From Swiss-Prot, chain A:
Keywords: Hydrolase. This is Fluoroacetate dehalogenase. InterPro entries: AB_hydrolase_1, AB_hydrolase_fold, Epox_hydrolase-like. It comes from the Bacteria. Belongs to the AB hydrolase superfamily. Epoxide hydrolase family. Its EC number is 3.8.1.3. Gene3D superfamilies: alpha/beta hydrolase. Fluoroacetate binds at R108, R111, H152, W153, Y216.
Length: 293, 289
């Protein structure tokens, strides 16, 4: 496996829930970056160097993904709820001495990030969420057209061991098909092949696949209920926020986020779902500008 | 593979789109019985005997399922649309001289049946559907709760080869998990083991699995659009109808049919195997007078 962050250090950070693996580089105000599914920290490799010119950049594997430890799950999928993931990432930031920091997330990592902002807002100076709406909004919109377009939320959420058994025959084919499908061109051309190999090796481990299904189970059940509480109570994030989305992505999104956040700006970018790999210069620039302003 | 139909013949019926396999027994008025997913005609083995006391009973494999031939599909999944399946079964019944008959179906076979009643109501004396609502109604109901409960409607409808590739690694597990999870018991104890082997053997074949996905792609697209036209026109099935459902709906069918009666049966989805006495008794009494 290639080193895609040349000159960045590496840290295995202890927490009460297990170790978090991270690459660490640059100098300046602290900025945590969080990937999602079906990827690892390496998806930030095209934008990290440029962010590292202006910030101390912490590129972490999510609890249970990549090289971070995989805690044993339970009947409510607790450790892979976004509430618990956020708590665990807060502890890992405190081990480095960061109690107030900037945060950007993508896909599941964006879900950890907004949940973090709702539960513990004093932790964040600013927040960016890339190509997502809140988990409550995804589910509230569900109808035949969305059910057919974005099927995997309900598939990976079926009780164990159904999705796990289906995915075990030919795991490479599933992970590569997902990566390609969500891009603008529908192929693997946007990704560095050494980044594709990181994703494929993680996806080849049955234990790593189980974590991803637990993540999506949490997505269908506890995460949804936690969001519902907040929207029914009218709670909005007060942290200044940016919503960036792909014109051809999965997530207008800015109008949805205005219901969830009192100080939000946003823009589309010409891209599929994978903004930091499909549109690196534009994504790096939008983030540097937002976090420096 | 076991003969589960004592005193029934075995027939291959020709049609313009391929052969339909059927077990045929009994005498008297004609009654066609249609299975669904993930099963074959064998799923009527416990109720067909009682029905054959009074009727001439035709127990057919759906187009592409079991031992029926598999017509070539196309980009709109045409031969696995319920409209096309019904036209093909209408042709099969004509090869036997049956142009007006009674019809009961379960799961996919019930969708063929109600679409047959909507398209060609003159073909049917009476109609029974087991544990379904119309395809349009399931889709209209597709919120978070339904997306989770009935996930396979969206998964099996994903463009080829995604579900076919996944089902290929351990098909025995997938079929047995479906059978089990929709029963009251949650295991395979309601089923005869010989019937389970018919279902496993059919599901073990990649070409039979592809047909199943074509059926669900039809269910997501043309079949939905067909139902939508009837709902927008206010069309109602005129044929006398019975809706049976597992306690583990009559109001829904009253919107789709002008002469409908209905009852729950103590059962999961697989009424003719979980609740064979009660299912047979209800069908016999409906179809008699
Ligand atoms: Ca320490
Ligand atoms: Cl979303
Ligand atoms: Cl770019
Ligand atoms: Cl069905
Ligand atoms: Cl019974």
């Amino acid at each position: 496996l290639a080193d895609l962050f040349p000159g960045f250090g590496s840290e295995w950070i202890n927490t009460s829930s297990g170790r978090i693996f991270a690459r660490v580089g640059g100098d300046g105000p602290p900025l945590l970056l969080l990937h999602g599914f079906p990827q690892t920290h390496v998806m930030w490799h095209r934008v990290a160097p440029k962010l590292a010119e202006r910030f101390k950049v912490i590129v972490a594997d999510l609890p249970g993904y990549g090289w971070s430890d995989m805690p044993e799950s339970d009947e409510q999928h607790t450790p892979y709820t976004k509430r618990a993931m956020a708590k665990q990432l807060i502890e890992a930031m405190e081990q480095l001495g960061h109690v107030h920091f900037a945060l950007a997330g993508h896909n599941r990592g964006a879900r950890v990030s907004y949940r973090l902002a709702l539960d513990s807002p004093g932790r964040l100076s600013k927040l960016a969420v890339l190509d997502i709406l809140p988990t409550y909004e995804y589910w509230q919109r569900m109808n035949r057209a969305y059910a057919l377009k974005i099927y995997h939320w309900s598939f990976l959420a079926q009780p164990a061991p159904l999705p796990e058994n289906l995915l075990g025959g030919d795991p490479d084919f599933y992970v590569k098909a997902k990566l390609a499908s969500w891009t603008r061109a529908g192929d693997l051309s946007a990704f560095d092949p050494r980044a594709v190999e990181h994703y494929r090796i993680a996806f080849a481990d049955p234990m790593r696949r189980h974590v991803m299904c637990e993540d999506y189970r949490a997505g269908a059940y506890a995460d949804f209920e936690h969001d519902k509480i907040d929207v029914e109570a009218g709670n909005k994030i007060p942290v200044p926020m940016l919503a960036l989305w792909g014109a051809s992505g999965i997530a207008t999104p800015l109008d949805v986020w205005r219901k969830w956040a009192s100080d939000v700006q946003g823009a589309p970018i010409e891209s599929g779902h994978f903004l930091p790999e499909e549109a690196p210069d534009q994504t790096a620039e939008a983030l540097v500008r937002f976090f420096s302003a």
